[PDB]
Amino acid sequence: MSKGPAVGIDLGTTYSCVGVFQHGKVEIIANDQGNRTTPSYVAFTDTERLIGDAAKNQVAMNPTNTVFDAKRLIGRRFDDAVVQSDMKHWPFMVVNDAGRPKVQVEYKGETKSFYPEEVSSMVLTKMKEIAEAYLGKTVTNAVVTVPAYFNDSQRQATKDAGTIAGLNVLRIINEPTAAAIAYGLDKKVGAERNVLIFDLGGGTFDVSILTIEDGIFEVKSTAGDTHLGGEDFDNRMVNHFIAEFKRKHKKDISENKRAVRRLRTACERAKRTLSSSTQASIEIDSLYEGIDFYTSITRARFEELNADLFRGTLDPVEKALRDAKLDKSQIHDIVLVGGSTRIPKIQKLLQDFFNGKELNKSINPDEAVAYGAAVQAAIL
């Protein structure tokens, strides 16, 4: 293989994305399964190590030895509140190695422990291989993104994950800076530009306020919810359907894990349909005790079941504006990042709050961070 170009990689908590600038535009690279985003999942089995789609596709079969959310651990001390809170939720072991957390798994009949940067390096290796598979050239140089609130230890641990993967990490840039670069907000003519990045994707919610003056990005404030996303929207739909089944059939399906899974999978798909249609239908034969469940949900009902969650997203906006000492009329640009910003009610709340101000959403939200990281990678 010959010498390849520089890539932009968005290393996410639940999914990762790689992009390359070629022939005048950014191309988001599809993985071996044809997916434009790859799960940030590493699975340790009796005979092998799986990364990406292959790791998530066996999560139900091997829950204790399938690691994800390493980004929630990377560069943190074991005693950190975030690590201690998060641990209860995870099916895999998190041990204390002299003040530093380590994921403990069963790999090839042996109990083995890994650092969060080692797990992320495996995810980075996969992202590198995806780009090499498409370009047909060796990929060494990369711009890797990190959240704006990441401290020195979290930033260095991300650079170390890059180094372990054999990548030359040209630059580590903030995720809201990458999103701003994707839309060319630093290339706009005038005085200092105040930008709000609304990031609702991968199970986290992050709001950042940036000031761009003469190409210098300044993080004025950060706010958000560490555990808020599409999974919560799906859960509210599942509750609605479980209640509907109790009303129509006087049967509780909630303790049959397979019936709940079939319902949850159908709900996630219906939620996606409700982003471009006002109605979605679901047909599930023999859901529980031989009962067929044929139903539908309107966009309006989906919004009602999630009203507190959707409205809730504006509190972080209010908190970030107050911390940055800025009124809402002082924001010149609003950028949408993450798959859940595709929800029409979410866009409406954010546009209404900013008094009819048009949102920057033309670039797929799931891809905008890797898109800007790839633009930055081409400039270097």
């Binding site: 089995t45 079969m61 047909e283 034969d285």
Partner: protein, 115 residues
Amino acid sequence: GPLGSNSPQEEVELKKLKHLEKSVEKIADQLEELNKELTGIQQGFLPKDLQAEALCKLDRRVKATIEQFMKILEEIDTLILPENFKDSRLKRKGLVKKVQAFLAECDTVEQNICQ
């Protein structure tokens, strides 16, 4: 709707279901091979410590078979069939019931080994 009104559009849905029937036949064969291996371990010369490992390796395989059957149900659940597509609706119901009977068999194995 009307009877003897077979449409070219239903041919498309029936082709999707036929592919899923084939995939279920393949997963079913795997289940039968797991059953033969189960009997093999039980009627073989493996001592307690070695049969334990052999049954757990089998447990992982059973879990893979259950997951594959679950991914077939999810795929079937993406189908929306108009009331008039009677032949498709009957084939979808028979396939789901066939998968649920194989899942019940997997559970018979899964609960009897490696625990």
